[PDB]
Each structure stands twice: as C-alpha cells, then as structure tokens.
Amino acid sequence: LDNGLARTPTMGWLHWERFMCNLDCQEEPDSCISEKLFMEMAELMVSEGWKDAGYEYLCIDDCWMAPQRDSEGRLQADPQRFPHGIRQLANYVHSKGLKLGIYADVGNKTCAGFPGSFGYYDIDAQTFADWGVDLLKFDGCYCDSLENLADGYKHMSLALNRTGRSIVYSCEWPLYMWPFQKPNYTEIRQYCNHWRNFADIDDSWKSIKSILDWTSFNQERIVDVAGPGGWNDPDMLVIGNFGLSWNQQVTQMALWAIMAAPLFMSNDLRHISPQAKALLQDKDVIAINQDPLGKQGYQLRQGDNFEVWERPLSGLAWAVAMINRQEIGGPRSYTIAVASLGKGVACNPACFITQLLPVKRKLGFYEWTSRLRSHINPTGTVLLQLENTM
Amino acid sequence: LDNGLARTPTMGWLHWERFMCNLDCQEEPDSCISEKLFMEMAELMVSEGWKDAGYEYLCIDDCWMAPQRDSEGRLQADPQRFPHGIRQLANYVHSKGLKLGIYADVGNKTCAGFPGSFGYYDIDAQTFADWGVDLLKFDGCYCDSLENLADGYKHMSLALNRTGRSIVYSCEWPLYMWPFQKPNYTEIRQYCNHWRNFADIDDSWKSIKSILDWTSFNQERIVDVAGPGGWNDPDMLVIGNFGLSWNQQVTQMALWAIMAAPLFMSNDLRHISPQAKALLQDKDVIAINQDPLGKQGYQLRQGDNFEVWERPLSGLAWAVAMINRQEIGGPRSYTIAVASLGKGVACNPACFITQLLPVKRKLGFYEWTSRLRSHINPTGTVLLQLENTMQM
Ligand SMILES: *[C@@H]1O[C@H](CO)[C@@H](O[C@@H]2O[C@H](CO)[C@@H](O[C@@H]3O[C@H](CO)[C@@H](O)[C@H](O[C@H]4O[C@H](CO)[C@@H](O)[C@H](O)[C@@H]4O)[C@@H]3O)[C@H](O)[C@H]2NC(C)=O)[C@H](O)[C@H]1NC(C)=O
Ligand SMILES: *[C@@H]1O[C@H](CO)[C@@H](O[C@@H]2O[C@H](CO)[C@@H](O[C@@H]3O[C@H](CO)[C@@H](O)[C@H](O[C@H]4O[C@H](CO)[C@@H](O)[C@H](O)[C@@H]4O)[C@@H]3O)[C@H](O)[C@H]2NC(C)=O)[C@H](O)[C@H]1NC(C)=O
Ligand SMILES: *[C@@H]1O[C@H](CO)[C@@H](O[C@@H]2O[C@H](CO)[C@@H](O)[C@H](O)[C@H]2NC(C)=O)[C@H](O)[C@H]1NC(C)=O
Ligand SMILES: *[C@@H]1O[C@H](CO)[C@@H](O)[C@H](O)[C@H]1NC(C)=O
Ligand SMILES: *[C@@H]1O[C@H](CO)[C@@H](O)[C@H](O)[C@H]1NC(C)=O
Ligand SMILES: OC[C@H]1N[C@H](CO)[C@@H](O)[C@H]1O
Ligand SMILES: OC[C@H]1N[C@H](CO)[C@@H](O)[C@H]1O
C-alpha cells in the first residue's frame, strides 16, 4: 500500500492473544477489554522503554464495540467498558506520543459477533478518521462470498484513503481466501500495509512451528512481494506470556526479525519478566527487523532437524538464523560453509560475524573458505549478523 | 518387588534424555557418554545440594558397554570412554555418598545395539553386583516374543536377588507388552521396583501432556497397584533443559509429585538455571512425592480445559493440583467446593490450605462448606496442600 506508512514493519501492542474477548469487568476488572486496560498499557509503553525501542502502535482488537450501532448508523464503543469513547482514548494515546489501532470486520459481524462493516465501509472509515485512529485491523468473518471479501477489502482500503488521514491498513484477506483459492499477493499488496497469511497464533511452541513451517512452504509465493509499504504478517509476538520456553521465545524473536514481520506484542506489560523485556527490546534484533531495505528473509536450508534462514540487509550485511528442531537431547552442533551464506557474497573475501541471540558475542573474521560452527539448543535459534569486510 | 527397596519413589539422575547415545568424544567431549561425565555429575550432585534434597542414584543409561563381552563372557565397559571400569566408577560414586545405577536389556541387544543380556542373566546380575551396582534399569528391546520378555524380566529379578546385593530393579516390561496384550500389573509389581508404562519422554510440553493424558485415561488400571516397593514410572524429569516454559516445568514437578513417580532428573547439572534448581529442590513438593503413605494420586476432575488431580497423604492431608490446559489467553479462574476435595475428608471439619506452586503462600482455614478459588496460568498448575484440622 503506497500510503507512505509501514515503510518498516509496524511495531506495537495488540490485546487479542493475551486478553481475548474478556467482557467480565465486574469479576475481572483488571483484565477485561476496557479503556482502563489500554490507558495502563499506554502509560507503561512510555515509562518502561517500549516506545523508545520502537513499539509505537497501541491497538484495540475485537470486542470493543457496543452491541449495536447508534441512531446515526455509526459504530460505537461499549458505553460501560469505554465510557469516554474511542476519540477520547485516541487523544490520550496521542498525548503520550503513541498511535492508536482499532479493529473491524469486512463481513456482517466481527468474529466475536459484534457489528460488521459490510454496508458501512465509507461510514466506518470516516468514523475512524474522525476518531483519530492511526491503524485498522480488518477481519474476515461472516462474509458469504469470495467476491464480497475482495470487494470489501479493496473498498475499505479506498475509503480510508479518501478520509485524508494516514491509517495503517492491516488485512486478513489472504487468510480467508486460502481455503478456497490462491490469493493474488500483488493485488493484496496494492491494497494493504500488511496481511495475515496463516491461522491465529496461540501461546504455544506448536503454533510457532506451524507458522514457520507454513511460511517456509509458501515462501516461493510470498517472500518477494514483501517490502516497504507491505508486509507478510505471521501474527503476534507472544514472548512474555506462559507457553514458550526461553529458547522458544528466542526463536520467535529471531525469526520474526528474519521474516521482516510486524512486531505486535500481545502480553501483559504490567507483569513481564526482565529477560522477556530485554529480548523484546533487543536493539540489534529490532534493527534487523527494521532494516530500511525491507527485504524479507527466507529459509535457505532444511535437514537433520536443522533449519537455516537468512535475510539480506542494508549495506552488504546479512542476518542468518539457525534453528534446532530436535526436541530431545542437548545443544546440537551445526556447521555450514560461509560461502553458502548470503548467496555466496556475504563473506567474499571475508566477513565479521557477530552472534546476537541467544547471547551477544563477537565470533571474529571468517574467510570465504571458512566454515561456521555453532551449537544450537533444542527448539532454540542462533541469530548472527555478517558484515562483509568490504 | 518385596526386596525392602524403593519404599518411597526412587530419586536420582539419569542421562538418557539430555545425553542420549552420543559416542563422539572427539567432536562432542562435553556431551559424550563417558566416565568423566558421570564423575563430574556425581561431584555436582554433592556440591549443589542435589543429594541433600534426596537425589541419591546416579544412573547410567544405554551406551556404556563395549561392543562385545570379554573372554570370560562377562559384559565390559567401553575401553575408551570408561577406561577405569565400572567398579572404580562405583567406588567414586559411593565415596561421595551416592549410589550407582546401570542399564541393560532383556533381549539380544540394547536399544542402541550393544550386548543384550539374554543368555547371561545370572552372569550379568553377578557382574553388576561385583561392580557395586545399586540399581538396574532393564530395557526391553530386541525381544519380539512375549514369553521371552516376561520370563527374562522375572529371571533377571530372581538373578539379582540371588546375588544377595540390594539392587533397585527398574523395568520397562509393561511398555513393551502393549503391542501384544495388556500387562498384568499385579505380576509385574511382584518382580519390579518400578515400571515404565508409556512412550519415552522428550523435552516438550506435548510429551508431558501425552504422558498425563495416558495416565489419566488408564488410571483405573495402574493407580491402585502403586505403593511402597513398586511404582508407576511416567519417565524422567526434564526440568532444567530447553523445551518447557516455567509454567510447564511447574506442571511436571507438581504432577510427578501427585503420581508418586520416581524422580529421575535428566539434565545437565553443570548448566542449570537457579529457577529450575529451586523447583527441582523444592522441599515441600519433594515431601509430597515422598509421602510415606505411598498412595498414588489420580485425576479427580476434567472439563472446560481444566484438570483437577489429588493425592491422599499421610495423616489425613491431601495434595491437590489444578491444571489449566487452555493454551491461549491469561490466568483463568477456577473454583471448587472444598468438600469435593479429598473424598470429603480433607476439610472435615476444616482444613488449612497452603499453596506450594507456582509460589508458596498460606491461604488459611477453609471449613467443610467453603469454596476454594484459584487462578491458574496457561499450561501451568496450582499445587495445594490441605491439612485436616479441627481448628476454625
Ligand atoms: C491515497 O493514495 C495515494 C496514491 O496511492 C497516496 O499518494 C501517494 O503518497 C505517497 C506517500 O505520501 C507518495 O510517495 C511519495 O512520493 C513523493 C513524490 O514527490 C516522494 O517525494 C516521497 O518520498 C518519501 O520518501 C523518500 C525516500 O523514498 C524520502 O525522501 C521522504 O521521506 C519522502 O517523504 C514518496 O515516495 C506517492 O507518490 C503518492 N502517489 C500518488 C499517486 O499521489 C496517498 O498517500 C494516499 N492517501 C492516504 C491518506 O492514505
Ligand atoms: C530376595 O527376596 C526376598 C523375598 O523374595 C527378600 O526378603 C523379603 O523382603 C524383606 C527384606 O527386607 C522382608 O521384609 C521384612 O520382613 C520383616 C518381617 O518381620 C519386617 O519386620 C520388615 O519390616 C521393616 O521393613 C519394611 C520395609 O520393607 C517396613 O515396611 C517395616 O515398617 C519395617 O521397617 C520387612 O517387612 C521380607 O519378609 C522378605 N520375605 C521373605 C524372606 O520371604 C530379600 O530381601 C531379597 N534379597 C535381596 C538381596 O534383594
Ligand atoms: C494480480 O493482480 C494484479 C493487480 O490486480 C495484476 O497485475 C495487473 O495486471 C494488469 C493486466 O491485467 C496490468 O494492466 C497491470 O499493470 C498489473 N498491475 C501490476 C501492479 O502489475 C495481475 O495480473 C494479477 N495476477 C494474476 C495471476 O491474476
Ligand atoms: C450479509 O447478510 C445479507 C443478508 O443476510 C447478505 O445479503 C449479504 O451478502 C451478507 N454479507 C456478507 C459480506 O456476507
Ligand atoms: C496376574 O499375576 C498374578 C501373579 O501370578 C496372578 O496371581 C493373577 O491371577 C494374574 N492375573 C490375571 C488376570 O491373570
Ligand atoms: O475476533 C478477533 C479475532 N479474529 C482474528 C482471526 O484471525 C484474530 O486474530 C482476532 O482478531
Ligand atoms: O537405548 C536407551 C533407551 N531405551 C529406553 C526405551 O524406552 C529409553 O528410556 C532409553 O533407555
């Protein structure tokens, strides 16, 4: 989408994975989907260094709406859970130097059963712009035809443009097309700043593996369309929650950097460990994810329960990730000729290699003839940056 | 097995899950199966508080043997990896106040392909006894006949008895029966101090879920057989390795306590986080696992991606574990009538409830009519101890 936005992958916080559709504000006031929850996350994004690291978009997912539209046919936030309304929340978020994302659905209802946007695309876009919304996640539930799906996503894209406000447009179009016909990613990229490809993430290593394996399987089709203005979205970061070991969290951070994925945390910023916070705020890894060149990495090799991924970066540098997919035993040794990396150019005549994950360590100079040897933890990843000696 | 051993579940360290059959001592010296690895592990078991916590048996798994037996037809240790031999390793282990377990197979070869014990049961039992072996793990590979499996396990049991040395006998008999017929656990308990029931564990939450779900599903068959001298073995503890989140590690520790499982760590004691060490050395949870009553717990309840397990303890106390199996979202609320726990006995007329996992905190007095309210993390477990009391 050529709207001047998402020139690097969007970074921020989205409530869905950790908070879901919790409407019980009476019994769970601190975890229900409410204006107070978002104010708390905004305050912590400022005070705990998240904004400084690049996490800029504070996004509402499903279950913010009132059960029905108002007398004017416009969407409204829930009167009890969002008493001051979305425009007022957007004012607060902006006063912290942050941006607000909101959620809507192309069909007749949202996935949770709240008002859909079919029939109201222009009214809904103008409402969002009037509210000061900075990003829209547009879901695909309750949509009876592929044609309505396509028409709705394109129509909403254009209506957002017509409002005159800069609004990141996050689509789920491919995900809902895929079971029925193969998406045309050139078209989707014309209309979307990033697009969900695969099933929802959850708090599990199984989910991470299946997202990586799907991206791996379809990379011929999706890698080259990604670039400034339009990204593949493998769904939220779940670092900081409950289901991933430290090494599985490292694998997610490293591979979301390799994949030039949007970095949407879905966690509880009020209760997050120092390790998880340091990983999500890792400056070198975010710099890889945010590389201005914007070329999505890809899987180079797969075999012996090992995976090698690499990503070309700005100025003749490369990122390389090595995954140990064996879920038994100990740190397993992997060696690869450095001449096989970076299309044979990364380390010709030589390169300086810095390991970034799981710990930062300079490895030294590698000649074009060298072999790189590493020990990779089960379900973990070693992330390296290669700088050509020039 | 009525040999006076394993009156509580055996506690120790077993190399298989973390170290497997790594024979490459040139390229992988720190992880190959060698006498130095076990000597170092023994020293760390002493110095790092593992022995004090109850972990007593330092156990070798597969891939310690030489490719064939010696001229006297006796098993021999690998010359390169175990140059000083099993007796000196046992002397070292004993000199640290620990006990040494070793491995063998009922069939013609071990699962890794080293000499089997069929034909040498008495010779091998005497070899182990002469070496100072204190525990035997007896695998079931390369024995495709049920009669040979059964007779071999019974035979090795009697041969160990004949040596006159106290040797914990750890069997895999039930696991290897399953392809053909359902085990007779009364007979297995007759011959074994503990017995592997289900497929090998690995470093994953999937593996733990599958062990728990199989145990739950089959609990009618196996729970009542367990008791002093003979235990169900759901396989090794993998806390301290790479595949489990903190909450999944808590779930394994808690539920191995509920199940009266042998506690065999399989990790690298040289590289283990303070958290994992504190969990594996948790004195209250180990005390539950080692409860002298020795009655295995069971799944009480299941539903809405929740599980409730409980275990009866000595002196009218109970352990209660609540598992959240929903792998999305945040901590989920669970409430239960305190009268539904512990067969209605735990909190009659009252009980004092102490949370032990994920953190230790006293919850207070709950009368028989009370409700217990808890919040459980995704894939995590809340472990509670209920002490029967007449006090308020
Ligand atoms: C509605 O849709 C229209 C058409 O798709 C869209 O207009 C496009 O806007 C983008 C960005 O605002 C334009 O891209 C810019 O083109 C100008 C040409 O003068 C360049 O100078 C810009 O360069 C930027 O980036 C440079 C490095 O690449 C930097 O030097 C600097 O940061 C510049 O800002 C940039 O390439 C694009 O040309 C137009 N296209 C058309 C047909 O007008 C509009 O933004 C959409 N409106 C909304 C509200 O979404
Ligand atoms: C070879 O096999 C035989 C049996 O096949 C085995 O001897 C048996 O097991 C134990 C040996 O320790 C004996 O059990 C003891 O019996 C006396 C009877 O008065 C009891 O006082 C003992 O009780 C104490 O220890 C128990 C722990 O086991 C506690 O439950 C109790 O509270 C006491 O502390 C104990 O029950 C059993 O009688 C024999 N049975 C026979 C001989 O028929 C022998 O040990 C095996 N040898 C080797 C080397 O394994
Ligand atoms: C996928 O969609 C794109 C855009 O909708 C198609 O590309 C356009 O094709 C028309 C001719 O049909 C050209 O006039 C345009 O210049 C093309 N646009 C771009 C950006 O290349 C493309 O043909 C579609 N692919 C398939 C296989 O249907
Ligand atoms: C919404 O419902 C109406 C009537 O039931 C139907 O005509 C329309 O196609 C639906 N829209 C979508 C996107 O499914
Ligand atoms: C199981 O084995 C024991 C010991 O031989 C025997 O007493 C019992 O009858 C057996 N059970 C069945 C069902 O055969
Ligand atoms: O109802 C909201 C949910 N619907 C999407 C389906 O992919 C999820 O990401 C989340 O937004
Ligand atoms: O070869 C060694 C393996 N044999 C058993 C099969 O279940 C495993 O526990 C491990 O001991």
Map B98-149 to HEC letters: CEEEEEEECCCECCCCCECCCCCHHHHHHHHHHHCCCEEEEECCCCCCHHHH
Distance from CA of A27 to the nearest CA of B (A): 10
Question: Contact at 8 Å (CB) between A288 and A256?
Answer: no
* Residue B11 in tokens: 């506690």
A16 lines ligand 6 (CB under 6 A): yes
**How many other CB atoms sit within 10 Å of the CB of residue B38?**
21
For chain A, the helix, strand and coil percentages under 3-state DSSP, each to the nearest 5: 30, 25, 45
B187 lines ligand 5 (CB under 6 A): yes
Please, which residues have CB within 8 angstroms of residue A150's CB and are 6 or more apart in sequence? A173, A177
Considering only CB atoms, which chain A residues are within 8 Å of B20? 328-329
Q: Is B14 annotated as a binding residue?
A: no
Phi and psi at B387, nearest 5°, equal -110, 120
Within A71-147, strands assigned E span 99-105, 135-139
Q: Is B302 exposed, middle or buried (0-12, 13-18, 19+ CB in 10 A)?
A: middle
Which has the closest alpha carbon to A384: A343, A349, A346?
A: A346
Give the side-chain half-sphere CA count within 13 A for B164.
1
Question: Contact at 8 Å (CB) between A126 and A159?
Answer: yes
- Which residue's CA lies nearest to atom 1 of ligand 5? B187
Distance from CA of B315 to the nearest CA of A (A): 35
- As a whole number of angstroms, the distance between CA A14 and CA A6 comes to 16
Question: Contact at 8 Å (CB) between A77 and A86?
Answer: yes
- As a whole number of angstroms, the distance between CA A311 and CA A299 comes to 9
Sequence ranges of the domains in chain A: 1-293, 294-390
> How far is ligand 4, taken at its centre, from the CA of residue B24, in Å?
65
Q: Which of A137, A200, A214 to mutate to test the pocket of ligand 6 (most atoms within 8 A of CB)?
A: A200
Question: Contact at 8 Å (CB) between B117 and B105?
Answer: yes
For A32, the 3-state DSSP assignment is coil
Please, which residues have CB within 8 angstroms of residue B187's CB and are 6 or more apart in sequence? none
* Residue B377 in tokens: 């993390």
For B87, the 3-state DSSP assignment is helix
Q: Is B43 annotated as a binding residue?
A: no
Q: Is the dihedral of CA B201, B204, B208, B209 positive or negative?
A: negative
Could you give the residue numbers annotated as active site of B? Answer: 139, 200
Please, which residues have CB within 8 angstroms of residue A343's CB and are 6 or more apart in sequence? A312
Q: C-alpha angle A381/A387/A389, rounded to 5°?
A: 145
Phi and psi at A120, nearest 5°, equal -130, 20
Q: Partners of A380 in the beta sheet? A: none
> Cα torsion at A304, B241, B26, B128 (round to 10°)?
-110
DSSP type of residue A68:
S
- As a whole number of angstroms, the distance between CA A327 and CA A338 comes to 26
Can you spell out the DSSP letters for A208-258? HHHHHHHHHHTHHHHTTT-BTTBEEE---B-TTSSS--HHHHHHHHHHHHH
Which has the closest alpha carbon to B110: B57, B67, B159?
A: B67
Could you give the residue numbers annotated as active site of A? Answer: 139, 200
User: Out of B207, B242, B380, whose CB is closest to A379?
Assistant: B242
Distance from CA of B357 to the nearest CA of A (A): 15
Phi and psi at A59, nearest 5°, equal -115, 130
Judge: domain B294-390, CATH 1.10.3080.10. no
What atom of ligand 1 comes closest to residue A164's alpha carbon?
49
> How far is ligand 3, taken at its centre, from the CA of residue A186, in Å?
7
CA distance readout (Å), A60 to A15, A28, A79, A93, A121: 6, 18, 16, 12, 19
Q: Which ligand is nearest to the CA of A147?
A: 4
Decide which of 3.30.390.30, 3.20.20.70, 3.40.50.720, 3.40.50.150 is the CATH code for B1-293. Answer: 3.20.20.70
CA-based nearest residue in chain A for residue B16? A329
Question: Contact at 8 Å (CB) between B108 and B117?
Answer: no
* Residue A35 in tokens: 């204006």
Judged by a CB distance cut-off of 8 A, whether residue A331 touches chain B is yes
What atom of ligand 4 comes closest to residue A108's alpha carbon?
1
Judged by a CB distance cut-off of 8 A, whether residue A144 touches chain B is no
Question: Contact at 8 Å (CB) between A55 and A102?
Answer: no
Considering only CB atoms, which chain B residues are within 8 Å of A202? 327-328
Phi and psi at A91, nearest 5°, equal -60, -45
Considering only CB atoms, which chain A residues are within 8 Å of B248? 243, 245
> How far is ligand 2, taken at its centre, from the CA of residue B50, in Å?
29
Phi and psi at A347, nearest 5°, equal -120, 35
Q: Is A43 exposed, middle or buried (0-12, 13-18, 19+ CB in 10 A)?
A: middle
What atom of ligand 7 comes closest to residue B111's alpha carbon?
1
Please, which residues have CB within 8 angstroms of residue A192's CB and are 6 or more apart in sequence? A1, A153, A157, A169, A170, A171, A173, A230
> How far is ligand 3, taken at its centre, from the CA of residue A156, in Å?
20
Can you spell out the DSSP letters for B174-200? HHHHTTTS---HHHHHHH-SEEE-SSP
Q: Experimental technique used?
A: X-ray
Judged by a CB distance cut-off of 8 A, whether residue A216 touches chain B is no
Which has the closest alpha carbon to A205: B209, B322, B382?
A: B209
Give the side-chain half-sphere CA count within 13 A for A289.
29
B186 lines ligand 5 (CB under 6 A): yes
- As a whole number of angstroms, the distance between CA A208 and CA A196 comes to 15
Question: Contact at 8 Å (CB) between B87 and B74?
Answer: no
